Amino acid sequence: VVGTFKAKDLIVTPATILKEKPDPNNLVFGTVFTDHMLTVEWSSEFGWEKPHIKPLQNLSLHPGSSALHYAVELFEGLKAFRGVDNKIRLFQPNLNMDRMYRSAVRATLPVFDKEELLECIQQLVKLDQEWVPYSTSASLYIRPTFIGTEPSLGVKKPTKALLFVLLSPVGPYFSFNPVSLWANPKYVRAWKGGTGDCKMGGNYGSSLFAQCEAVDNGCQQVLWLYGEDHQITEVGTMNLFLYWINEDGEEELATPPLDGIILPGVTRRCILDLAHQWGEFKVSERYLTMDDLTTALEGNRVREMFGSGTACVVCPVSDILYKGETIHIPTMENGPKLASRILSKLTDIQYGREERDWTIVLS
Amino acid sequence: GTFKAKDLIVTPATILKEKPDPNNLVFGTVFTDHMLTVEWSSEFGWEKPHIKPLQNLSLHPGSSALHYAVELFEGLKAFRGVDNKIRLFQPNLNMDRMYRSAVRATLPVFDKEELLECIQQLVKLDQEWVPYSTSASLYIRPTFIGTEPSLGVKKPTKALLFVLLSPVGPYFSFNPVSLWANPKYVRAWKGGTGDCKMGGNYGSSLFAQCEAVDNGCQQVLWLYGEDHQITEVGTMNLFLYWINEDGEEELATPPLDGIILPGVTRRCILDLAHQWGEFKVSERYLTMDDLTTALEGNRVREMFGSGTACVVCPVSDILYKGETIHIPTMENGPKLASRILSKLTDIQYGREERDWTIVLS
Ligand SMILES: Cc1ccccc1Oc1cc(-n2c(=O)cc(S(=O)(=O)c3ccccc3)[nH]c2=O)c(F)cc1C#N
Ligand SMILES: Cc1ccccc1Oc1cc(-n2c(=O)cc(S(=O)(=O)c3ccccc3)[nH]c2=O)c(F)cc1C#N
Ligand SMILES: *Cc1c(COP(=O)(O)O)cnc(C)c1O
Ligand SMILES: *Cc1c(COP(=O)(O)O)cnc(C)c1O
Numbered sequence: 001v002v003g004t005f006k007a008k009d010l011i012v013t014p015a016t017i018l019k020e021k022p023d024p025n026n027l028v029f030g031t032v033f034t035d036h037m038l039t040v041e042w043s044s045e046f047g048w049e050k051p052h053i054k055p056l057q058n059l060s061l062h063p064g065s066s067a068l069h070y071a072v073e074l075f076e077g078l079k080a081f082r083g084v085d086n087k088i089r090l091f092q093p094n095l096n097m098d099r100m101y102r103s104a105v106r107a108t109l110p111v112f113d114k115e116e117l118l119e120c121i122q123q124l125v126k127l128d129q130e131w132v133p134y135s136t137s138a139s140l141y142i143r144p145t146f147i148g149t150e151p152s153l154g155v156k157k158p159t160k161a162l163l164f165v166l167l168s169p170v171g172p173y174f175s176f177n178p179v180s181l182w183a184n185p186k187y188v189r190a191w192k193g194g195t196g197d198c199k200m201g202g203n204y205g206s207s208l209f210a211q212c213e214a215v216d217n218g219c220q221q222v223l224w225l226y227g228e229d230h231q232i233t234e235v236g237t238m239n240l241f242l243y244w245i246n247e248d249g250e251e252e253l254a255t256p257p258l259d260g261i262i263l264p265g266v267t268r269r270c271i272l273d274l275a276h277q278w279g280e281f282k283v284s285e286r287y288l289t290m291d292d293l294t295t296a297l298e299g300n301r302v303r304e305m306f307g308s309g310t311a312c313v314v315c316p317v318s319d320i321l322y323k324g325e326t327i328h329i330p331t332m333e334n335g336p337k338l339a340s341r342i343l344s345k346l347t348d349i350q351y352g353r354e355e356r357d358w359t360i361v362l363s
Numbered sequence: 364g365t366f367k368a369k370d371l372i373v374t375p376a377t378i379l380k381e382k383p384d385p386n387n388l389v390f391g392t393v394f395t396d397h398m399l400t401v402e403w404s405s406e407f408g409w410e411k412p413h414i415k416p417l418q419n420l421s422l423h424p425g426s427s428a429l430h431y432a433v434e435l436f437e438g439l440k441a442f443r444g445v446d447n448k449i450r451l452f453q454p455n456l457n458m459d460r461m462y463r464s465a466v467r468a469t470l471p472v473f474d475k476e477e478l479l480e481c482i483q484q485l486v487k488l489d490q491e492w493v494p495y496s497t498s499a500s501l502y503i504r505p506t507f508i509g510t511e512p513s514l515g516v517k518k519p520t521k522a523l524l525f526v527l528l529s530p531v532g533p534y535f536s537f538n539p540v541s542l543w544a545n546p547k548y549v550r551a552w553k554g555g556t557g558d559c560k561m562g563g564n565y566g567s568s569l570f571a572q573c574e575a576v577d578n579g580c581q582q583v584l585w586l587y588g589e590d591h592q593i594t595e596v597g598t599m600n601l602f603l604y605w606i607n608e609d610g611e612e613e614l615a616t617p618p619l620d621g622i623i624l625p626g627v628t629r630r631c632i633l634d635l636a637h638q639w640g641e642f643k644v645s646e647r648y649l650t651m652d653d654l655t656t657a658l659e660g661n662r663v664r665e666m667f668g669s670g671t672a673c674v675v676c677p678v679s680d681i682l683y684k685g686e687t688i689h690i691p692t693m694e695n696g697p698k699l700a701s702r703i704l705s706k707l708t709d710i711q712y713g714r715e716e717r718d719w720t721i722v723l724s
């Protein structure tokens with residue numbers, strides 16, 4: 001009956017005892033949580049309950065919950081930034097609401113009003129705003145999560161769900177400290193006709209084995225390969241950019257196209273928009289193979305390779321382990337000039353050093 | 364290391380729930396009085412196993428089962444025999460598959476015989492839930508989740524293994540199924556986890572299943588590749604009983620090349636077909652074009668799905684490219700489907716002795 005929850009209906013239960021904030025420079029990504037969380041219950045019978053901001057607490061879930069059996073779940077990732085003017089800003093948060101709604105439809109989780117969820121998120125951040133670090137290299141990570149909670153082993157559209165939001169203060173990185181990539185084509189992240197273009201939990205559970213194999217070989221991320229010609233698709237959890245002289249001898253920033261096996265990153269979209277705006281080199285959404293890359297390296301045609309994502313912004317790549325060899329990528333010996341310029345521009349926008357359509361000041 | 368059944372801590376319920384009518388059972392909606400839980404940490408390993416009253420789980424909202432689908436499950440049944448002895452059916456094959464699923468999920472390994480003994484003790488305590496009916500059974504749902512309170516993408520350092528029991532009727536609610544065949548959706552890929560019972564394989568498949576039901580179909584016919592290989596009957600393995608291209612009587616099923624879940628029911632059916640030695644048994648690729656060419660030549664006898672929940676699930680129709688393609692399964696007996704169902708149910712309910720059953724602990 002209640003088609004969507006409304007921020008105007010928020011019930012706020014503040015915590016009695018507030019926790020000590022961590023040192024911004026000693027932060028391990030996603031291990032520290034703020035005082036409060038957002039929860040909103042849904043049922044097929046009654047629709048959306050009123051949204052709650054309350055102290056961070058365990059979830060009480062029926063052990064038959066479809067999130068635990070059939071990965072009926074999705075998540076988002078976005079950040080709050082304390083500006084040089086001390087105003088807290090979100091970055092492109094409507095793109096995260098759009099993507100979460102699209103993910104929910106694909107997961108068969110109940111739809112919600114995107115503007116009402118964003119307002120509830122703003123009110124949660126506002127309450128916990130002293131967690132948004134006083135540092136131009138740290139931020140508050142925002143993790144909207146949406147799970148099936150129906151107490152039934154049936155394989156079907158859930159009749160019960162929980163939408164919740166966690167906040168986690170994070171440093172500039174995770175622990176330019178460049179990443180080594182593990183490339184093993186025996187493992188495939190995502191396929192045409194699959195859900196790799198949605199942020200659904202199921203995409204990541206199936207990717208964990210390759211990630212643990214990467215870390216066992218001293219690599220931080222998996223280079224995700226696709227098809228008989230070994231297309232390079234994603235830098236682990238991040239979109240893939242290659243800055244090089246292409247086959248026609250033109251300076252080019254290249255990234256794989258949104259053909260269904262690529263997560264359409266907010267950071268990816270912003271980087272393409274900046275590169276188009278600058279007009280200093282060719283910008284191509286195009287297929288890239290291991291053979292394209294190794295042929296280019298042998299011709300000294302590669303300048304830079306980096307991943308893009310909310311957590312890293314720009315993540316330079318120095319090495320790829322492939323067929324038993326270490327292939328060096330000369331990113332850090334080429335500046336990295338473009339990676340640095342992109343990171344400078346995005347952080348200038350995020351921390352309010354310049355005005356942008358891409359940021360909103362916290363309500 | 365492993366938890367040990369000899370260490371079981373049993374907390375019996377003081378208030379029992381009313382048992383349901385065996386003839387009114389909706390699959391997986393009714394749960395018994397007790398559950399099994401076992402905690403693991405990287406720091407200290409496996410804690411002692413607990414049998415205690417069914418309860419909600421208390422999970423940190425950062426638990427990797429909720430964000431990154433760090434989870435797997437199993438499905439097997441307990442049967443009250445015609446002699447009133449409760450039997451499990453091929454449960455060691457479920458333990459083998461659950462162990463393999465755990466390794467692929469990066470969840471901690473455990474001793475398969477210790478888990479089976481703990482499952483036997485749980486069923487024994489809740490044995491009056493095993494229905495008094497030769498067409499009902501007790502569904503057993505071992506489940507294994509990552510519970511580490513961290514958004515890190517990494518091997519979990521905290522996990523919970525639990526087992527739920529659910530009495531179930533005949534079927535879900537021979538009532539043959541109609542299949543929805545749309546090649547725009549792909550269940551599983553080579554280099555993926557489709558050959559393991561990991562939660563992630565199923566969350567991504569729900570959209571197609573809801574589209575199937577909207578078109579009056581009970582299951583999705585999972586198609587793969589440019590040639591539209593027929594792979595799985597929704598949640599079930601796919602069998603085709605036909606005259607093949609060489610004019611030989613043949614039972615065909617897709618091979619285990621990485622996109623097929625290796626079913627216990629599938630294994631039992633191949634074992635029986637090989638034992639009978641009355642026709643060719645082939646693990647081979649089957650395409651929509653193979654099927655339609657065969658139907659036009661009146662070469663198809665039967666198509667059925669196999670799984671713990673259905674045993675043998677006859678297929679009457681496939682909706683494909685806007686046509687209903689009739690499969691003549693129910694006009695051909697279905698003789699093989701019936702023979703298989705008769706044999707497996709005879710073994711499950713102790714109407715004949717078999718190496719495939721264990722009488723309860
Ligand atoms: C109500 C009804 C009437 C007639 C035929 C089917 C019916 O319901 C369905 C049940 C299932 N279904 C489950 O609900 C659970 C399992 S399971 O728990 O045994 C299992 C889960 C995951 C993988 C393998 C088995 N396996 C299943 O097939 C399904 F997938 C689709 C439908 C539909 N429509
Ligand atoms: C410890 C360390 C040292 C140096 C570089 C990275 C390091 O940590 C890692 C972080 C991540 N990692 C996360 O843990 C979470 C997200 S996330 O929450 O932003 C995210 C998760 C899922 C999809 C998209 C983003 N994104 C990530 O890359 C990872 F996958 C692998 C490693 C490794 N090794
Ligand atoms: C989340 C994600 C990205 C990057 O998305 P952003 O919106 O830039 O944070 C890239 N690839 C994969 C696989 C992802 O899950
Ligand atoms: C579980 C499962 C089967 C059949 O497994 P059984 O062990 O026979 O119950 C078939 N296909 C898929 C996709 C499955 O998940």
Ligand SMILES: [Mg+2]
Pocket residue numbers: 113115116
């Ligand atoms: Mg509105």
